[model samples]
Structure formats: structure tokens, C-alpha cells
Target: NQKFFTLSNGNKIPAVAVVGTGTKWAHAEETDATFSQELTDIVKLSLDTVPGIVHIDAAEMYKTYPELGAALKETKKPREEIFITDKFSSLHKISEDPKSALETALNKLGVDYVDLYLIHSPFFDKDLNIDLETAWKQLEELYKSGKAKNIGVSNFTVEDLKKVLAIAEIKPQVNQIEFSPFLQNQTPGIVEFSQKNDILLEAYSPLGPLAKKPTDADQQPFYQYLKELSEKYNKTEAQVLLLWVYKRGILPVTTSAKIERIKQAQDIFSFDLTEEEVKKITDLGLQHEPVRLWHVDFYTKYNSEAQK
Candidate 1:
């Protein structure tokens, strides 16, 4: 029933935000250009036409742009009403820094400030190792500068998080991760740590059931379970997933460039899933855990389960 959440910093964000990277898995329709006005417009169009789509997850890692800048030009909603999120890519390269990273993003986005900025991953820096202490200190500087309204991280484990929390003056407001009924069981410690610390968890790849290769509807138990719930709630599977995300008290970050899918994502709030029914959908993961699709070599080092 709670479609929105107020962060520890007192900023309220909708339970779901659209990821403008085209798609979480490799289904993006646009080229890798820095300014795909078409992609940008679709994002803005979703905000204008679709309800509850108040935030966007945009990152240079997707190598997609014209993503935020182009949308700002014509959106009817003022900048304050929209929560724009971007990531600091500098964490990986010793040669790069968060200040310069955010500056580069701002220059390309044509915006002075971003509502939320995240350190894409704690493990990104392969060599010339940019430790969390160093990178986070830089993030804290930027956080105080006001260029990034709120700061957080993505893909961090409990150990990785404590290293940052050990020295962080400004605590992380959120921890974006690959979470679902399936993945949840793998890391109860991380979940417990976040809950006790009051850090909000954001579930990316909410469509984990469909991201696996054998996407045929008949093949996945999780997929079939979601479908069954979709029928019960009279909503699309995507809509049903969003509701489940909210029911779990986690914010969901979903991506799509399709007009119908974008609008349908908002329809999750049209109905509710009872606690019993939500548990049925949740336990479907025990039937089978879908393979993770975006397992880059770096991520695979941490998670051996990543598909090749």
C-alpha cells in the first residue's frame, strides 16, 4: 500500500523508478551515443503520461545518454518534482574521480544537480585500487557540495558495506542490489544488516524470472508463479512484480523503453497482493532460482553463480 518511501535523509521517493538505460539485460534499442534524444524523450514521456514514475536510474555505465539532458528540455514537471539518479563511474579507474565523474555526467545531462548519485559498486576498481575509504571520502565531499542530493552504493555485500560504514561520515541512504525472492535466500546477512542499519534496499532486475535464457513462459516455475499472481490481481506480470517489491518494503528499479510497458508498470498500484498470496509468489523462488544475466567478469568474481 505504501508506494513511496522517505529516505533516512528525509527525502521522499516513489517505490518504483524507471531505469532509462533501455533495459537491464541487453535489450536496449538505442545506440551507445551519449545523447540519444529519442531515449531521453521516452523517459520524459513516461514521467508525463505514466503515474508514479518519479525517479530514474541513469548511469554512464550503460553508455546511454541524451537520456536525462534531452528530457529536461521539454518536461512539464519542474526539476524538483523529478528524482534523477546517476552513478559515479570513477570508482573503477584510478585515473578518474567522483567529482570529475559527476561533472562529466552533469555536463552530458545538462543539469546542475542530480537527486541521487551512487557508487556503482564497491568492487569496481580492479587495479590502482580505489578503496572505498578514498572513493567515499570523495563522495562525501560531493555530497556536501550539493551537486548530488543523496549518495548511496550498488551491488555491495555486508562486508563491503561495513568497510564504507566504518569511515563514512554521511551514511549511505540506500543499497541497490540484485534482490528477489530467489536471490534473497542467498544473503540473509546482508538483508539483516541493511534492516538493522535502516538502509533502504532497492531491487534491480525485478524481472529476474524472465532474464534467464529459457524465457519460455512454460519453462520457469517462478515465471508461472508470477503469472498465477498476475491473474489473481488482474495485472500484468511486470505490474505484479512491482507490487511484490513494494509489499516487501523494497524500492524497485525497472527499465523499459516501450510505451505500453512503461504505463503498465504504474498500474501495479491498482491492486494489492494479500500477505498469503505474496508469500506464495515469494516461495516460488525455492522452486528455482533464475540465472543472473548481467554477470560481467568483475561481478562474476564475487558471484560464481553468474552465467557466462
Candidate 2:
């Protein structure tokens, strides 16, 4: 599964990956080396799995960061073999020296430098003066110094991306969003804008697990349709959900510790959805009662602030 998504700079990024969250999704952090055994299992499974399991989505806030370092060192999978994408957060606008953020991350991440680094959000702390440009500027320095192979953002709208593109010499290569059928209409223009601009969209929750949950939407025709196609394609609803996302040229990233489910994720690669069928799901999804699960600020300010 060495499926590589080429960046603007000719670097290949794994199209899918297992994401590690900050504190909620991880065990209590410890000062020791072997972070958490639970975290170790998850990272090991993703790196050791078949096909092209080569990327690990990490964040500075992730409690199991030490676990990632432990996995990389213990697996001995070669440092370059694993692609690490970490987030740089403003932390309520406290830390100055944008370079300091990456330095701390690199130190704790147990890596010389990260493959890709992203500005977690466009939300700025007024007192800090560290706006998007300020943060991105530091990221560029990292890229130039070989600290970060690539730099991008997450939860930023198309207009926000355009601002970066306008001033950026190396231009952002990726934009991650709370993407899924639920957000198609919940947040419009983002996917199309990214596509037209050559910025690849990384989908956080392709299964719509955020919104109404599977049962809440189970009565809707869209849910029934998903079920029908799930049977026809002999795949789970999660796998079927990936088909629509794939057709849109989006990368779906998820985290799971279950061995069978983790392996079954590759099942999406086996089947193909026709062009017409892909649009059908897209249409139905667009019609669902819109409900955004997280990042309501993105929706609230998308029109006002995102509109250049």
C-alpha cells in the first residue's frame, strides 16, 4: 500500500494515515520512555501493516507523543520510512517565537525534523500577534532549514488558504478539515476550492461519525442508500463512505486499535464506485439536515472571515 500523494514539491505523502490526538485520545502522559503500551500498539499496527502504511498524524498536544517516539525507535523501521505530520498550536496565543514550537515538538517527537508541519487553526490570539502569516512565516523557515519537509494548515477555509498562497513562496500543499458527507453542505465551497487550487484535502472523518452517529442518520434515505451499497460492494458503511471521499480526491484519515477493523480499512481499495454512483451519494449527502460536529467557529466565521 505504497500509495503516495505527491506534494507540490515532488514529495510523496501517504494518502491515508492513523491520527494521534492530544490528551483525550491518549493515556496519561509519563516522563518515562515507553509512553503507553496502548499507544504503542496503535502506532506499531499502522507502521507494520501491509500496503502503504507509512504516515502518522501527530500533534504537539497529543499525550502519547512519547509513545510515537518509542514506537519509531523500537520498530527500527528506519526514521525515513515513517512520515510524521504534526500540528503547531497557538496554545491560547501564549508562546511567542514560532520556531520554539517546532523545536519543542522535534525534541519530544524524538525526530530530527518532521516530514510535514501544519498550523492547527487560523484562530489568532489578539494579544499574541501570531496570526496566520506570522505562524506560516516561521513554518517556511523550518522548511528552508530542513526542519520541516512540508508546511500546511488544518481547519482553514479556502479563503484562508488563498491568503497563504498569495504570500507563500513554497505554497501550502495540504488543507485538512472536518470533512465528510455531513460537512459537504454544512461547509460549502471548501472542497471545490481546494480542488481547483491544487491543494489536496485531508478528510478527518469520512464516515460522518461526528454528526448524528450511524443510528441517528440510519432512518434517512442516505443511510439506507449507504446500507444498500454496503451490501452490493460487500463492504462496511465506513468503507463505503471512503468511496465517495476517494472520488472527490480527498485523503481519509482515521485512528483505530482494533486489528480487524484496521486491516479491513484497506478493503476500500478493492472496489470501485462508478462516476454516477459517486455523485448519487454526494447529492444525498448534500441534502441531509446539516449538523457540524466540531469546530463550530469555522462555520460561524467561515463566511465573515474566510471571505477575503
Candidate 3:
């Protein structure tokens, strides 16, 4: 498919992927089959209905591996046909013990290997006073062992990524982050550097505006601009945002239990946004203060603590 992106390792990844828990799954009882069945149906719907929607994004932190396993077990699709992306948890112990972490995910997911595996965040390494290079070397061993088809890092700023680059026997294939028009330049040069080094930036919250609370008056202008763009492009504001990310060569990972919304995401490819439109939207986005909705505590406290 034209929408699939090629990783540095020559692996083709879908432009969009589905997260395990959100919308419908959020209300599901954590300890029951409800979440499992929901995930299975989401996966089945995406796979059966949407073209090029083969990527399933999971993580240890989300505890969705079992649901993902149930989906795969029920789907009975060949492992190679689906692309599974998972991550090591941010817990220091789990970060330290990469072998057991991967094995645990594999065991829960009922898979021999994942298409892509990542270190959850750089903060965990920093929190435990562990060297980033050494932490990455453990993942390298996982990559070499073939349990993780491709290895990468998530939530790593350029500084940490540089450390990994200096000693890396295998370069990181992806750097998943909270990327959107609002926070596009929050880390300054991470995106540019990742692009230059061929490290794919997988965006977690590409629809940042949508995630904002309805009472967020400060974001109204941004929403208004998107509404105008949506009209101009003949696409939903969400699609416009995803297309902008796509134009920048980033893979957007999103989730929804609704089949129409899942299918709606791929509609971004139907139209194109101009260079000026993309740049203008990013410029407008930067005008407002940057916000990191997820992991605010970590970024605010841990980052300040590290600075001290």
C-alpha cells in the first residue's frame, strides 16, 4: 500500500496503528474477558475491513498483551501477516531485566516474536541512574536474539538518543513520542535528528486537540483553525491532523472501538495537504503554550529533579 512506511531495517509499517485500550475498552473490566473480546473484535474489524490496518500497538504498561493474545488466537491469522509493536515497561526492574520482560510479553501475547520492540522511556534509565547506552545494549541483545524483530526507544529526547547512537551496534528503528501540532517542537530537534538518522518517529497522541477537555477554552482557536482546514480539505479535523503527521513521515498510533472511526482514519490518504498548509498549521500550533497531557507528573517532577 502507498500508505505503508518503510523502517530503516527495511520493514514496512502501516501509517496508522490501533492502541489496545480506549473508547470502548476503557470501560471494560480489567480482569475479565470483556476487554479481550473487545480487543479481538477491534482487531478483527480493522484487519477484515480496513486495508493496510495490520499494525496492533501494545505495551507492558497498558497490560493489553493478554487481550492482544486473545485477538490473535481468535483471528488465527498467520503471525507474519500482522505487525505487533510492544514495549518494555518503564519500571526500573523491568528495564534492567530486558530478557524476562520480552519473554513475559511474548508469553502473554502468545507470540514467538514481535515486529517491533522498544524501551519505554529514557526517564526510567535516568531514574535508576543507569547509563542509557548499557540499557540499550540489553535491547540490542534482544534484537540480535530475534525475539524483537526490530528494536527502538520511546519518549527519548535527542540527548539520550545521541548516547545510544554513539555506542549502538544496531540503530534504533523508531522513537515513539507524544507528537502533535501542539507539541511538535517541544523537544526542539528530536524530530529532525530522528529523521536525519532514519529513526522513525511513531506519534502516540497525534490528535492532541481531540484529547483536550471540552472546557479547554485556550484551545478553541486551534480547534477553529482545524475546523477551517477540515472544510478546506474536505476531511475531518482528525484526518487533517493525521495527514499533517503523515506528510512529515511519522506513523500515527491511535485507537477506537468504533469501526467507522477506525476506517475513517485511513481516509487521510484520499486527499493531500499543501506544504504551506502543513507549515502554517504547525506554526499556529506553536503559537500556543505546549502541553504534555500524558506523563505530566514525570515530565514536570522527574525532569526538574534531573535538572537539579
Candidate 4:
């Protein structure tokens, strides 16, 4: 069974399993090409095996769009069944050719239209001073021209959304951000704003970094709590974390290498966490607070002046 949410654009999006790329360039070493390719293969394998997963979020298209297109074309899957999303690279902004960049993504992805297109980030090269509204207008034209089905933003704050809404004829249909039980960015105003405006808040990093190899000491307590809950609910820690996101009414984008774990992640839809259990986890956000692993460094590098 598929769960769907109607976006403001009147487009129905799957409630979950918006396929994500395997490697994040920011997190991995630039030289680790072998690992990156392995991860990409794993993601493709998961898509092949998984049922009810319709949308393929092609974030890696920005890195090497042509290579991504070639690989996807090799999948032999029907183009219409997949949804491609790429960001407006800062490089494109410098050239003052964001529309041309999107067309390049379309050509490289071997798709007639992208399901969703997003502005990659708020930060831009100092010299470019990229006009986000201008970029978004270009995206809107894509939507009007049927090059993209929807338009959205990533890594944008509420203030950013406000600025965009002022000029946007079609307000953002989605806002993808780092969200998890530890990084519950469901701040009151943010949540209210999305609900009021009919914007979908997509959760990235829904499992938190606790599952990653280098688990932090600060995450230990939260992990212990999830472990205990997993036993109580007869589920895995990842399941519990994912369920928390579901309970919050946001779609969680997740990835796994193990075939069994991918199935386990899907099993979340079969069971519902009790209200009391949900509250328990929600309260945990108070004491053993979990913050994003990349938050400090991101702000430090990109918004250093604002930080000061």
C-alpha cells in the first residue's frame, strides 16, 4: 500500500521512501571513489528489490550529472517511475545560467521532467551573490514548462522561506533538512509555518549518526534509551528512530546497505508507536539532547560572520 500526501502544487508525493543517493561528498573523502560507487550500487539494488518505492531522489546528479544519467539509464527502469532532483550548483549561478544548468540536469538524467527540483543551499560564492529569487523564478518557469513537476528548497531556515514566499507564485512544495529524534528541527514556528502553508518537511538523516561507525559519547545515552525501547517493542533501533519521524507526520528519507535492514525499515509502516511511547521519546529530546553532527562546522564555514 502507498501513502500519499498532496502538495500545495496539487501533486501527490509518496509518504516515504524518496530514494536518496548513497554518498554525500561533504561527509566522505574526495579520494574515496571506490566506496562511493559501492554505496551507489547498494542504493540501486535497494530500489530494485523494494516495492512501493516510486520516487528516486537524485541528489548526486549535481556532482556528475552525466554519469548519473548513464547509470540510471542502464537500470532499464521506466523513466516516468523515477523522480529526479538536483540542486542549482553555485558554479551555475556564477555563469548566470541556472536555467541552462537545469536543462543540463534534464538532458543528463535522460528524463523529460524532474519530479521535484530544489535550490541546493542558501550559501553562495561571495562574488556571485546569487539571487535566490531569480533562481527560483527559473525553476518556476521549468514547472510552467513541464520540465519539473514541483519546486522546493533544501537547507533553508524559516527566514529563508519567508524571503522566498514573498516573490514565489508557487511557494515551495518541500523543504528538505537534517531532521531526527536527536535533531528534532520541528521547532514550533517552523512546524506551524509548514502546516499553514502546505509545505512538506522532508527529514534527512532520520536515523541519526548513532547507526554510523563513529558513534559519539554524547549519543550513548540516547542510544541506550532506543535500545531499551527496541527491546520493549521488539524492533531495531533504526525502526524506533524512523517511527519517531513518522509519528511527527514528516516523511523520512533513509538509506541502508543490508537487504534485511531495508526490509526492516519498511516494516515501520506496519506498526504504530503508542502515544505514550511517542511522548517518552519526545521527552528524551530534552535531557540527552541530540544535535546534528555537521551543524557546528557548517555554520562555522558558511555563516561565520553571522555566528560572530
Candidate 5:
């Protein structure tokens, strides 16, 4: 539990569970005042249970936006201790106005400074025609002005990260992506790049099974191996999977509605997975394994001209 990772900005970030914004935006619209209050309550409860958690990445604050500022005021946690991360919306890309967009996030979140700000996705609609470099430069200006402490990208591929690094004066401090035992393709090269550049790798979906009900096809040789390992270690398969991520020196953002399950997740830090077990799980990685629930094809079909 004492383990901490240092960010490129020289800030020591806890290798702990980060409450995500995914749940708040499940309705496909901005959060209302009632939902925001409910979210703040959940966050407050989580903070009470886990005192070690010192940082929060509030990316979804934009949904229930203008009301978020009041929620932060109510929570009353010191601003510096809590880290907030917001995204640049696709609609804002046409004008490439990150400054005004970021200002909106700050005012909505009621925070004077954001610990990190990220470019949410690599793909944009044809009408928007987002220039990544231009968005990045705007983020850099925010960093320079002290509005944002760190800047990075989410869902960026290896190639995308390279493109950012090419023109970037300040390297990205983190790359938040979908990483789990099932989706290991991005890690090998991504981890190497992160280690080389001193960037942190944040895993969003560490528990791959939750995204979808496990089918017979999903029962791969790896699952049997993981079940055996789980029994041997006297842990649940979920814990084993989460431990796999921690062993790789990556921070995992996991969620649970059950309070006991939340505490059970913290137990992963108490034990370690052996090298052989780690290797066994890691070797399961294969090309185009289809681990992600969000398919590019769905977006492509919805927006026919949208690039995958």
C-alpha cells in the first residue's frame, strides 16, 4: 500500500484505485445535480474507507458540468491533494479552442488547477478534423500557465504516442488505456516507452470480464490457468487479474458497487504473483484478440465517414 510512482512532473502519485467517470456518464448525457450529488456521496464514502487514496481523476465532471463546481465546494477536500483530469471534447476541435474548453472544466469542477488534462481520444469526426498537434500545443500552454499540472492522452496507440512525442516539448506524463490480461497488446511496447520516457501507464479496464459476460469462447487456456493460480493463491480470479496488472508496474483503476468487494480489491497489494505465474498469464497475449467491448466498427457504422 505504501508503493508510489513518481510522475514526470516529480509528483509522487499513489498506486491506488482511481474512481472513474465512466459510471456517471452511462446515461449518455451530462450528469444532473442529483446525479452529481450521488457521485460526490460515493466518492466521499470511498475516501472515508480508503484514506490512502489521495488523488482523483474527474474526467466526467463535464457531463453534469456547471454543477460540478458546487459539488467540489461541498466535498471540501483540499484542492492540491486531489488531482482532477478533464478531456477536450470532439465538438471543441473545429475551433481548436482548448483554452476556453479547459476553463469550462475548471469552473465546472470548481478547482483552480487540474493535476492532469488529457486528449480523450485519437479519432475525430471528419467534419471536426481535429489536429492532435494543435490540441497538444494548447494543452502545453495550459501546463505552462499553471492551469494544468500534467498533460497526456487516453486510448492512444503506440503510433499516436510517437506522434505526440515528436513535437512535444514536455513529454506526456501518462497514457491511460484499456489494459488487462485479455488486452495486452498495448502494454509490451507501451510499457517500454513509458519506462524510457518516465511516463506512467494507467490501466482503465483491469478486470476484462466485467465488460461482458464470459462466454465459452472466452474460456481460453489462460482462464483455466488463472483459475488454477487463483485456487493455489487462495484468491479470486478477479484479484489474480488485478495483481497481474500491479506486477507489471502499472496503476489499475477498478470499481465495485459492493463495499466488501472494494476492500477485497485492496488486498491485491498484500500479495505478489510469482514470476512463472506472471509469465503464464502474459504469454496468453495474441494478435487481434478482441478484448475491448467498445468496437471501432460500431462507431464506424454509426458515423460512416468516421475513421476507425
Candidate 6:
């Protein structure tokens, strides 16, 4: 049986997913002819081959709704059988009603209601001026209307989360964040707060450390530690990392286009990491300053002390 995490709303979500169709694939030109087919094929392949993967994490900003829409039809699976998570980007003009934006996503996705919908980030600017209170109200309306089975936010720090909590009629079910041993050290407050408040922390990049150049001097210690654990458990480093995230009770959302890597990700369900191992990873992560794959400006600009 595949692993599932029950949301605060009492809905079950797969423990992991083939997310954002390879995170950067979200940036591909909408007109790139191959972009459409390549992503469609990846979705179809992940569904057809991976046994435990039946969920897709998508975002309106990814511009992938159509491709995913097509794959759902091609796979011949009932719409209700697959869990689809979509996001409303912070970049959407705050003046426009969020319902219109969601309607556009639903139309492009060829779906009536997404299993879960999230406000993609907490960052608001002069150009993107919807405050957390304003944003959450819009999401709450959608939740009440049943267009969003569950609602949440992403990339929110503890302070950001608290602001929403103050005004929320329906609390956020999950707070999706960039997570790994490397970045975990940076957001420990978010983790603790989410746990205390019954908000699930969904990690978007659980294998971020492996992306570092092994020869790079900075993360060498972390790599050595991971390699040792990998050998001891007879599991790939990716599996060790995912298992560690899972061990911490956080949902790990990973992405891989290759069927083999996609299948390999689910193997974490087969092993367990000792509590000592999990704590050591957290300790080691804190020893190094955080290295984030996204939102560097937000972290460095607003939370400069964390970079120390």
C-alpha cells in the first residue's frame, strides 16, 4: 500500500508525488513544441510505471495544466482516482478576483475541482499587493464553494503563517516549502510551528543536497554523512534523504522525469531511519548555513541573519 498523510481537513494525500513536472520545466516557453510533448510523456510515464505514485503537484505558474490535462485523458484513469494539487501564483494581479484565476486553471486543466489548491507563496510586493488576510479569504471562499477540496499556502515563514492564522476562518492544511537537510536548518521554526498547529509541511525538494557538486567544499561533510548512511542501509543516497524527511513526519514531494528515478523514490517506504540518525542529520544541517534552490532573495533580503 502507498503511504498517505491525512491533512488537517481529514483528507488523505500521497506521501510523495512527481511534482511540477520537474520544477524548472515550469519555466519552459509555452510555445516550445517539444515542451508540451515532453511533459505529457513524463506524466504518462510516471503514472504508467510508478506503482505508488498517483498524485501530481502542479502550479498555475508552471503553465502545465494543458499537458497534465492531456495526460489524464491519455492514461485512461478516472479523474477521481488521481490526486491533483494546483497552486494560485502570487504573481496574479491582486485586483482580479481569485475565482477568475482558478476558473482559468480549471478550464485549462479540464477538471472541475482540484483535490488541493494553495496560494503559491507569502511574498507580496507593490505589484503583488494582496495581503495574507485578503489572500486567505479568497482561498476560504473557494474552499467553502468546494472548488478547492482543501486549501493551503506555500513558502510561508512562521510569521507569515501566524498572520494568516489570526484571520483564517479555515486554517491552512499544509505549508509547502523548499526542504532538505540543507534547508531544514533554515526553517526549523516553520517546522515546529506547523507541527504545533496541525499544519502539514510538504517538502518540495527533498533531495537538494545531492544536486550539489560532490567535489564542492561546502557541503562535503553532509555528503560524507549521507554516503555512509546510504552504504549502511544499502539504499541510494536519494532514498536515504527521502526516508530521513519521511522519518521527520514531513511529506516529501519529489520530481523526476526518468521512470527509474521515479520508481526509486517510492523505495523509501521500505526502510526506516533510527531517531538518532534523523537527529544527526538535523544537527549536521544546522552546522552549515542554508543553501536554498529557490527564493534566495526573500531569505537573504528579509532574513539575512539566517545566512550566518
lDDT of each: 0.71, 0.70, 0.74, 0.65, 0.65, 0.76
Instruction: Choose the strongest candidate by TM-score.
Output: 6
Q: What TM-score does candidate 4 get on C-alpha atoms?
A: 0.81
Candidate 1 per-residue lDDT, tens place, 1-308, comes to 32677788887777787545644323346444335666766777876776543678887576654556667766776776677887776444623777777888888777888888888877666663566788788878888999988888877778878888999999988888777655652233666687678788888877776555364666677677777877877888888877787788788788786878766766667788899867877777655543444434445444433211
Candidate that beats the other on TM-score, 5 or 6, i.e. the better one = 6
Q: What is the lDDT for 230 in model 4? A: 83
Candidate 6, clashing residue pairs? none
The global Cα lDDT (0 to 1) of model 1 is 0.71
TM-score of each: 0.86, 0.85, 0.85, 0.81, 0.79, 0.89
Which residue pairs does candidate 2 place in steric collision? Answer: 1-51, 1-52, 22-62
Clashes of each: 1, 3, 0, 0, 3, 0
Those runs of model 2 whose alpha carbons end farther than 4 Å from true positions after fitting are 22-36, 91-97, 127-129, 185-188, 209-218, 298-308
Kindly list the per-residue Cα lDDT of model 3 for residues 1-308, writing each as its tens digit: 43788899898887877444433454545653346566667876676666554677877776666667777777745666678888887654443456777899888778898888888877774455455676688789888999988899988878878888989999999999878876774355778889999999998878876775458654577677778888987887788888888888898877777777767786678888888888877777776566666656555433322211
- How much is the lDDT of residue 124 in candidate 6? 61
- State model 2's lDDT: 0.70
Over 4 Å off in model 4, which ranges?
22-37, 60-67, 90-97, 127-129, 186-189, 212-221, 295-308
Q: Cα RMSDs of all predictions?
A: 3.7, 3.7, 3.9, 4.5, 4.9, 2.9
In the range 1-308, model 4's lDDT, one tens digit per residue, is 65666788788776665456634333455633323455455555655666664555565323555445655766655665555666666523524445776777777667778788877666544555557888788878988998878888876767778889999987899877667765665332555577677788777777774557344644566566778888888988888877777787777777665757766776677667888778777667545444564335454333222211
State the lDDT of candidate 5 residue by residue for 1-308, as single tens digits: 54566788886665656555545533435334345555565555555565454445556424655334554676646655555666666432523456777887777676777777877766644555447887788889999998988888876767778889999988888887667765653433655666677778777778875455458634767677778878898888878887888787777767665545556666677778988888777776432254654434422232211111
lDDT (Cα, tens digit) per residue for candidate 2, span 207-265:
66433456566688778888889899888887778667777788776666665555556
Residue pairs of candidate 4 with colliding backbone atoms: none
User: In model 5, where do residues sit more than 4 Å from their true spots?
Assistant: 25-37, 60-71, 91-96, 125-130, 186-191, 210-220, 231-234, 285-288, 298-308
Global lDDT of model 3? 0.74
For residues 209-307, write the lDDT of model 6, one tens digit per residue: 777645674457777787889899899889888878888888888887666777778667877789999888777766766668777767655343332
Per-residue lDDT, model 4, residue 103, is 76
* Ranking 3 against 6 by TM-score, winner: 6
